[PDB]
Short mmCIF file of all heavy atoms in Angstrom, two decimals:
data_model
loop_
_atom_site.label_atom_id
_atom_site.label_comp_id
_atom_site.label_asym_id
_atom_site.label_seq_id
_atom_site.Cartn_x
_atom_site.Cartn_y
_atom_site.Cartn_z
N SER A 1 0.81 -1.21 0.02
CA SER A 1 0.02 0.00 -0.01
C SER A 1 0.84 1.30 0.03
O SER A 1 0.55 2.21 -0.74
CB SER A 1 -0.94 0.00 1.19
OG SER A 1 -1.93 0.98 1.15
N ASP A 2 1.91 1.30 0.81
CA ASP A 2 2.88 2.38 0.79
C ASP A 2 3.57 2.53 -0.47
O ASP A 2 3.78 3.68 -0.97
CB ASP A 2 3.87 2.21 1.93
CG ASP A 2 3.26 2.23 3.31
OD1 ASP A 2 2.40 3.12 3.61
OD2 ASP A 2 3.58 1.31 4.22
N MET A 3 3.96 1.36 -1.13
CA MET A 3 4.64 1.34 -2.46
C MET A 3 3.71 1.90 -3.53
O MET A 3 4.11 2.69 -4.37
CB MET A 3 5.03 -0.08 -2.78
CG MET A 3 6.18 -0.60 -2.01
SD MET A 3 6.84 -2.16 -2.76
CE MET A 3 6.10 -3.34 -1.68
N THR A 4 2.39 1.53 -3.41
CA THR A 4 1.40 2.07 -4.28
C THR A 4 1.22 3.59 -4.14
O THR A 4 1.17 4.27 -5.25
CB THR A 4 0.03 1.36 -4.00
OG1 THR A 4 0.16 -0.07 -4.06
CG2 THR A 4 -1.01 1.67 -4.98
N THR A 5 1.19 4.03 -2.97
CA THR A 5 1.07 5.47 -2.68
C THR A 5 2.29 6.22 -3.18
O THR A 5 2.11 7.33 -3.77
CB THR A 5 0.84 5.80 -1.22
OG1 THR A 5 -0.23 5.08 -0.69
CG2 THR A 5 0.47 7.24 -0.89
N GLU A 6 3.45 5.69 -3.02
CA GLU A 6 4.72 6.28 -3.47
C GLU A 6 4.84 6.27 -5.01
O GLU A 6 5.29 7.30 -5.61
CB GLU A 6 5.91 5.54 -2.89
CG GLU A 6 7.07 6.47 -2.44
CD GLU A 6 6.62 7.55 -1.45
OE1 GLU A 6 6.45 7.20 -0.22
OE2 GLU A 6 6.50 8.64 -1.84
N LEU A 7 4.40 5.21 -5.57
CA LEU A 7 4.38 5.08 -7.05
C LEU A 7 3.39 6.10 -7.78
O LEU A 7 3.70 6.69 -8.74
CB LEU A 7 4.05 3.67 -7.49
CG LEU A 7 5.01 2.89 -8.44
CD1 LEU A 7 6.43 3.29 -8.19
CD2 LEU A 7 4.71 1.30 -8.09
N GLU A 8 2.25 6.23 -7.04
CA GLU A 8 1.22 7.24 -7.51
C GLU A 8 1.78 8.70 -7.43
O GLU A 8 1.54 9.50 -8.40
CB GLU A 8 -0.02 7.09 -6.67
CG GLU A 8 -1.03 6.10 -7.17
CD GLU A 8 -2.19 5.83 -6.27
OE1 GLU A 8 -2.82 6.82 -5.84
OE2 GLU A 8 -2.54 4.65 -5.94
N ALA A 9 2.49 8.98 -6.30
CA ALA A 9 3.05 10.27 -6.15
C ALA A 9 4.21 10.54 -7.15
O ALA A 9 4.34 11.59 -7.70
CB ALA A 9 3.65 10.47 -4.71
N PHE A 10 5.02 9.40 -7.42
CA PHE A 10 6.05 9.51 -8.39
C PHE A 10 5.56 9.82 -9.80
O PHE A 10 6.16 10.57 -10.49
CB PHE A 10 6.94 8.20 -8.33
CG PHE A 10 8.13 8.24 -9.24
CD1 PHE A 10 9.31 8.88 -8.90
CD2 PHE A 10 8.09 7.56 -10.45
CE1 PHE A 10 10.39 8.97 -9.69
CE2 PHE A 10 9.24 7.64 -11.33
CZ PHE A 10 10.34 8.28 -10.90
N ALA A 11 4.49 9.17 -10.14
CA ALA A 11 3.88 9.26 -11.51
C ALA A 11 3.31 10.69 -11.76
O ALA A 11 3.19 11.10 -12.84
CB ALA A 11 2.82 8.23 -11.70
N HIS A 12 3.04 11.40 -10.60
CA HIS A 12 2.39 12.73 -10.68
C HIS A 12 3.40 13.87 -10.60
O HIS A 12 3.09 15.00 -10.74
CB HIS A 12 1.40 12.91 -9.58
CG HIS A 12 0.01 12.59 -9.82
ND1 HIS A 12 -0.38 11.46 -10.59
CD2 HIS A 12 -1.18 13.29 -9.58
CE1 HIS A 12 -1.68 11.53 -10.73
NE2 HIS A 12 -2.19 12.60 -10.20
N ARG A 13 4.76 13.50 -10.51
CA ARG A 13 5.77 14.52 -10.42
C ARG A 13 5.92 15.32 -11.69
O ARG A 13 5.99 14.78 -12.80
CB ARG A 13 7.05 13.79 -10.10
CG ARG A 13 7.30 13.50 -8.62
CD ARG A 13 8.36 14.29 -7.97
NE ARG A 13 9.33 13.55 -7.19
CZ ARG A 13 10.58 13.72 -7.10
NH1 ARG A 13 11.21 14.82 -7.70
NH2 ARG A 13 11.43 12.96 -6.37
N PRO A 14 5.82 16.69 -11.55
CA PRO A 14 5.83 17.61 -12.72
C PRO A 14 7.15 17.49 -13.48
O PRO A 14 7.22 17.84 -14.72
CB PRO A 14 5.66 18.93 -12.04
CG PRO A 14 6.15 18.75 -10.64
CD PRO A 14 5.75 17.39 -10.26
N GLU A 15 8.25 17.03 -12.88
CA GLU A 15 9.55 16.94 -13.52
C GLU A 15 9.55 16.06 -14.73
O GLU A 15 10.41 16.16 -15.62
CB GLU A 15 10.62 16.57 -12.53
CG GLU A 15 11.02 17.60 -11.44
CD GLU A 15 10.44 17.20 -10.06
OE1 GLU A 15 9.24 16.92 -9.82
OE2 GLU A 15 11.32 17.12 -9.17
N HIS A 16 8.65 15.09 -14.69
CA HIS A 16 8.52 14.13 -15.77
C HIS A 16 8.18 14.84 -17.14
O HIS A 16 8.61 14.32 -18.19
CB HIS A 16 7.54 13.10 -15.52
CG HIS A 16 7.84 12.05 -14.45
ND1 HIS A 16 9.05 11.41 -14.49
CD2 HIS A 16 7.20 11.64 -13.35
CE1 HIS A 16 9.15 10.64 -13.47
NE2 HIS A 16 8.07 10.69 -12.82
N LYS A 17 7.48 15.95 -17.10
CA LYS A 17 7.11 16.79 -18.21
C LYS A 17 8.41 17.29 -18.89
O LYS A 17 8.44 17.49 -20.15
CB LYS A 17 6.23 17.95 -17.83
CG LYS A 17 4.77 17.65 -17.87
CD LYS A 17 3.97 18.83 -17.94
CE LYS A 17 2.91 18.78 -19.00
NZ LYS A 17 2.03 20.02 -19.15
N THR A 18 9.45 17.67 -18.13
CA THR A 18 10.68 18.11 -18.71
C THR A 18 11.79 17.06 -18.47
O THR A 18 12.97 17.32 -18.34
CB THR A 18 11.14 19.42 -18.11
OG1 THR A 18 10.93 19.42 -16.61
CG2 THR A 18 10.29 20.59 -18.54
N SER A 19 11.33 15.76 -18.53
CA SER A 19 12.20 14.62 -18.57
C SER A 19 12.00 13.89 -19.80
O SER A 19 10.99 14.04 -20.48
CB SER A 19 12.02 13.75 -17.39
OG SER A 19 12.88 12.62 -17.39
N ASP A 20 13.01 12.93 -20.22
CA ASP A 20 12.91 12.23 -21.45
C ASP A 20 12.74 10.70 -21.14
O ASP A 20 12.65 9.89 -22.13
CB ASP A 20 14.07 12.47 -22.34
CG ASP A 20 15.44 12.33 -21.56
OD1 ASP A 20 15.60 11.58 -20.60
OD2 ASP A 20 16.38 13.00 -22.05
N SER A 21 12.75 10.38 -19.94
CA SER A 21 12.79 8.89 -19.49
C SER A 21 12.72 8.74 -18.06
O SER A 21 12.81 9.76 -17.21
CB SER A 21 14.07 8.26 -19.92
OG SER A 21 15.20 9.07 -19.57
N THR A 22 12.50 7.58 -17.48
CA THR A 22 12.56 7.26 -16.10
C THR A 22 13.01 5.79 -15.80
O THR A 22 12.91 4.94 -16.66
CB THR A 22 11.20 7.52 -15.45
OG1 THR A 22 11.34 7.68 -14.02
CG2 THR A 22 10.17 6.42 -15.60
N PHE A 23 13.48 5.66 -14.54
CA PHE A 23 13.89 4.27 -14.08
C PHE A 23 13.14 4.01 -12.79
O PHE A 23 13.13 4.89 -11.85
CB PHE A 23 15.41 4.22 -13.83
CG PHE A 23 16.14 3.83 -15.09
CD1 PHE A 23 16.48 4.93 -15.96
CD2 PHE A 23 16.72 2.65 -15.27
CE1 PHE A 23 17.22 4.64 -17.11
CE2 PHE A 23 17.46 2.41 -16.46
CZ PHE A 23 17.79 3.35 -17.36
N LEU A 24 12.55 2.86 -12.66
CA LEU A 24 11.89 2.42 -11.47
C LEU A 24 12.64 1.13 -10.98
O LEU A 24 12.67 0.13 -11.63
CB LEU A 24 10.42 2.13 -11.67
CG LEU A 24 9.36 3.17 -11.70
CD1 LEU A 24 9.43 4.13 -10.44
CD2 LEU A 24 9.31 3.95 -12.92
N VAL A 25 13.24 1.19 -9.74
CA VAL A 25 13.96 -0.02 -9.24
C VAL A 25 13.30 -0.54 -8.04
O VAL A 25 12.97 0.22 -7.08
CB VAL A 25 15.38 0.40 -8.89
CG1 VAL A 25 16.20 -0.88 -8.57
CG2 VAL A 25 16.06 1.12 -10.05
N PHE A 26 12.85 -1.80 -8.03
CA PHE A 26 12.32 -2.51 -6.89
C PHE A 26 13.21 -3.63 -6.44
O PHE A 26 13.76 -4.42 -7.29
CB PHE A 26 10.91 -3.08 -7.28
CG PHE A 26 9.95 -2.03 -7.76
CD1 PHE A 26 9.82 -1.74 -9.10
CD2 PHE A 26 9.07 -1.46 -6.85
CE1 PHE A 26 8.92 -0.81 -9.54
CE2 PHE A 26 8.12 -0.52 -7.30
CZ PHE A 26 8.11 -0.27 -8.71
N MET A 27 13.49 -3.62 -5.11
CA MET A 27 14.37 -4.69 -4.53
C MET A 27 13.75 -5.23 -3.22
O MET A 27 13.66 -4.44 -2.29
CB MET A 27 15.79 -4.20 -4.40
CG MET A 27 16.42 -3.68 -5.68
SD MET A 27 18.16 -3.17 -5.50
CE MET A 27 17.90 -1.76 -4.32
N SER A 28 13.34 -6.45 -3.18
CA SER A 28 12.64 -6.98 -2.06
C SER A 28 12.69 -8.57 -2.15
O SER A 28 13.17 -9.09 -3.08
CB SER A 28 11.25 -6.41 -1.92
OG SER A 28 10.59 -6.90 -0.76
N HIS A 29 12.03 -9.16 -1.17
CA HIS A 29 11.56 -10.57 -1.23
C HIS A 29 10.40 -10.61 -2.27
O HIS A 29 9.72 -9.56 -2.45
CB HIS A 29 11.10 -11.04 0.07
CG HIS A 29 11.06 -12.54 0.21
ND1 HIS A 29 9.98 -13.31 -0.05
CD2 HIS A 29 12.08 -13.42 0.54
CE1 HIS A 29 10.26 -14.65 0.07
NE2 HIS A 29 11.50 -14.70 0.48
N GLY A 30 10.34 -11.71 -2.98
CA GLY A 30 9.28 -11.89 -3.96
C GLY A 30 8.80 -13.35 -4.07
O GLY A 30 9.44 -14.29 -3.64
N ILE A 31 7.54 -13.44 -4.53
CA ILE A 31 6.90 -14.70 -4.81
C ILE A 31 6.29 -14.71 -6.18
O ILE A 31 6.41 -13.61 -6.91
CB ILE A 31 5.80 -15.10 -3.72
CG1 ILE A 31 4.70 -13.99 -3.75
CG2 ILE A 31 6.38 -15.20 -2.34
CD1 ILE A 31 3.39 -14.45 -3.04
N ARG A 32 5.59 -15.76 -6.64
CA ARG A 32 5.06 -15.80 -7.98
C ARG A 32 4.12 -14.64 -8.31
O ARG A 32 4.09 -14.06 -9.38
CB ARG A 32 4.26 -17.15 -8.21
CG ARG A 32 3.84 -17.38 -9.60
CD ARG A 32 4.96 -17.44 -10.68
NE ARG A 32 4.52 -16.83 -11.98
CZ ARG A 32 4.42 -17.44 -13.06
NH1 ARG A 32 4.51 -18.79 -13.11
NH2 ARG A 32 4.00 -16.90 -14.16
N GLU A 33 3.26 -14.26 -7.27
CA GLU A 33 2.26 -13.14 -7.46
C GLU A 33 2.87 -11.79 -7.61
O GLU A 33 2.22 -10.94 -8.28
CB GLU A 33 1.29 -13.14 -6.25
CG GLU A 33 0.30 -14.36 -6.23
CD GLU A 33 0.78 -15.51 -5.39
OE1 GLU A 33 1.81 -16.13 -5.64
OE2 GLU A 33 0.07 -15.86 -4.40
N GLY A 34 3.96 -11.55 -7.01
CA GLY A 34 4.71 -10.28 -7.14
C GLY A 34 5.74 -10.00 -6.05
O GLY A 34 6.34 -10.85 -5.56
N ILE A 35 5.86 -8.68 -5.84
CA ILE A 35 6.86 -8.11 -4.81
C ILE A 35 6.33 -8.05 -3.44
O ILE A 35 5.26 -7.57 -3.25
CB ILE A 35 7.43 -6.78 -5.28
CG1 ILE A 35 8.12 -6.96 -6.80
CG2 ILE A 35 8.36 -6.14 -4.32
CD1 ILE A 35 7.93 -5.70 -7.63
N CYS A 36 7.10 -8.50 -2.44
CA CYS A 36 6.67 -8.52 -1.04
C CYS A 36 6.79 -7.15 -0.38
O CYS A 36 7.90 -6.49 -0.46
CB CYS A 36 7.41 -9.55 -0.27
SG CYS A 36 7.33 -11.23 -0.84
N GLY A 37 5.72 -6.73 0.29
CA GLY A 37 5.82 -5.54 1.18
C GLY A 37 6.43 -6.04 2.55
O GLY A 37 6.41 -7.23 2.82
N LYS A 38 6.73 -5.06 3.41
CA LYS A 38 7.40 -5.41 4.68
C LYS A 38 6.54 -6.24 5.60
O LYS A 38 7.08 -7.00 6.44
CB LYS A 38 7.89 -4.05 5.32
CG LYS A 38 6.82 -3.23 5.96
CD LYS A 38 7.30 -2.25 6.96
CE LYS A 38 6.27 -1.68 7.89
NZ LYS A 38 6.73 -1.24 9.21
N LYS A 39 5.24 -6.21 5.40
CA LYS A 39 4.32 -6.92 6.30
C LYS A 39 3.90 -8.31 5.79
O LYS A 39 3.01 -8.98 6.39
CB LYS A 39 2.99 -6.06 6.54
CG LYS A 39 3.20 -4.95 7.49
CD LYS A 39 1.96 -4.51 8.16
CE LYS A 39 2.03 -3.16 8.88
NZ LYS A 39 2.52 -3.34 10.23
N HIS A 40 4.49 -8.79 4.73
CA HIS A 40 4.04 -9.96 4.08
C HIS A 40 4.26 -11.26 4.86
O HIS A 40 5.28 -11.50 5.53
CB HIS A 40 4.82 -10.17 2.69
CG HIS A 40 4.49 -11.46 2.00
ND1 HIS A 40 3.29 -11.63 1.33
CD2 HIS A 40 5.06 -12.63 1.91
CE1 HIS A 40 3.20 -12.84 0.76
NE2 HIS A 40 4.26 -13.51 1.17
N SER A 41 3.21 -12.15 4.80
CA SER A 41 3.18 -13.38 5.41
C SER A 41 2.39 -14.36 4.53
O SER A 41 1.56 -13.88 3.68
CB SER A 41 2.52 -13.33 6.76
OG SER A 41 3.27 -12.55 7.65
N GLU A 42 2.66 -15.67 4.70
CA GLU A 42 1.83 -16.69 4.01
C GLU A 42 0.41 -16.66 4.33
O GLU A 42 -0.51 -16.80 3.51
CB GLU A 42 2.40 -18.09 4.31
CG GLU A 42 3.16 -18.74 3.17
CD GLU A 42 2.40 -19.84 2.47
OE1 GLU A 42 1.57 -19.55 1.62
OE2 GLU A 42 2.80 -21.01 2.75
N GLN A 43 0.08 -16.28 5.66
CA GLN A 43 -1.26 -16.09 6.17
C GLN A 43 -1.90 -14.79 5.66
O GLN A 43 -3.08 -14.80 5.18
CB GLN A 43 -1.28 -16.18 7.63
N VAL A 44 -1.21 -13.70 5.84
CA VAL A 44 -1.72 -12.39 5.41
C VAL A 44 -0.73 -11.78 4.29
O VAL A 44 0.27 -11.23 4.68
CB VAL A 44 -1.92 -11.37 6.55
CG1 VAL A 44 -2.52 -10.16 6.15
CG2 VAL A 44 -2.66 -12.16 7.71
N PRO A 45 -1.11 -11.92 3.01
CA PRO A 45 -0.28 -11.40 1.92
C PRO A 45 -0.15 -9.90 1.88
O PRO A 45 -1.15 -9.24 2.13
CB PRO A 45 -0.97 -11.97 0.68
CG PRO A 45 -1.98 -12.99 1.20
CD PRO A 45 -2.43 -12.49 2.61
N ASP A 46 1.04 -9.45 1.55
CA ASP A 46 1.29 -8.06 1.30
C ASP A 46 2.08 -7.86 0.06
O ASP A 46 3.36 -7.88 0.14
CB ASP A 46 2.05 -7.47 2.53
CG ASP A 46 2.26 -5.92 2.48
OD1 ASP A 46 1.45 -5.16 1.88
OD2 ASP A 46 3.22 -5.36 3.04
N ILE A 47 1.43 -7.98 -1.02
CA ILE A 47 2.05 -8.08 -2.36
C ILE A 47 1.78 -6.89 -3.32
O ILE A 47 0.58 -6.53 -3.46
CB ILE A 47 1.62 -9.44 -2.99
CG1 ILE A 47 2.16 -10.70 -2.22
CG2 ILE A 47 2.03 -9.51 -4.44
CD1 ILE A 47 3.69 -10.69 -2.12
#
């Protein structure tokens, strides 16, 4: 959820208008479904 909020804020940055490209880097634990958030568990997924 925090990653989602941050990505939404990043996408809204006005500097992109005067940019020619962007890089998004994600580094974490991961499973088949996607990237793990800090709260992730097998019982309660945070993906």
Side-chain angles (χ1 to χ4, degrees), residues 1-42 44-47:
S1 190
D2 297 314
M3 289 192 259
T4 303
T5 304
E6 221 56 78
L7 238 28
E8 274 174 48
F10 186 76
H12 264 45
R13 278 249 230 144
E15 291 110 303
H16 287 312
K17 272 200 129 180
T18 44
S19 179
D20 52 26
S21 54
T22 198
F23 278 78
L24 277 313
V25 189
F26 301 90
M27 302 181 298
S28 185
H29 201 265
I31 59 161
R32 189 61 217 250
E33 287 97 298
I35 297 148
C36 302
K38 70 160 201 157
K39 286 202 190 275
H40 178 77
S41 298
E42 255 253 79
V44 189
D46 187 28
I47 294 298

